[PDB]
């Protein structure tokens, strides 16, 4: 299944959807995998999250050129940490329109990230304000509340059974909630549950640091997060 392409791994999840995976050494924790998504929408490609680095992100674009060979219309990144936004410069060098939560763009410089070009804003209920996500096609963007970070966002893919929780969601066999350095411990559980409620039909849950799983990823993550309160 997996396709090794340089130092990255690509996995097809559905007819028009692939997972990208890249790795960074976290001294004291090992080589940490981070996953994002690639979606073909007709004659264009949409990306969710960069790789950890500019070089790795350029490799994602190389893989897309080889395996899909259509223009990348836009990328959306799911918060201002390196695993999700570290390759912003590579996207910009490639001429790709980039989007992030307004709060992610605000936080980007202090987090050592380059901001996206465009800011998403959200209604009180968490759904993206449609004017701020033009031409997103099947990507349905939802802010579930603060959890892994204050700015974490999530993405459903219309026409598929897939929803992407980014670093908010861990798989059903995870022992912990990972790096909580920037987490909102009080609200994490409710935010994980809100993600599930936003995408009730999604049977395949994709996330940053585990392989795709069932919705038990959501229930298990939320149940673990109940212990943070
Ligand atoms: O992260
Ligand atoms: Zn993060
Ligand atoms: Zn992460």
Numbering used by the authors: 42 to 270
Could you give the paper's own sentences about this structure?
As one of the resistance determinants, metallo-β-lactamases (MBLs), including imipenemases (IMPs), Verona integron-encoded metallo-β-lactamases (VIMs), and more recent New Delhi metallo-β-lactamases (NDMs), are Zn(II)-containing enzymes that activate a nucleophilic water to cleave the β-lactam ring, conferring onto bacteria the resistance to the last resort carbapenems and all other bicyclic β-lactams that are currently used. In particular, NDM-1 is one of the most widespread and threatening MBLs that binds and hydrolyzes almost all β-lactam antibiotics with Zn(II) as a cofactor. Moreover, the active site of NDM-1 is located in a shallow groove encompassed by several loops with Zn(II) coordinating residues, which confers conformational flexibility of these residues for efficient substrate binding and catalysis turnover. Crystallographic and biophysical studies demonstrate that Bi(III) compounds irreversibly inactivate NDM-1 by a unique mechanism, with one Bi(III) replacing two zinc ions in the active site.
We first crystallized and determined the high-resolution native NDM-1 structure at 0.95 Å, the highest resolution obtained so far. No significant overall conformational changes were observed between the Bi-bound and Zn-bound NDM-1 (rmsd of 0.18 Å over all Ca), while only subtle conformational changes were observed at the active site.
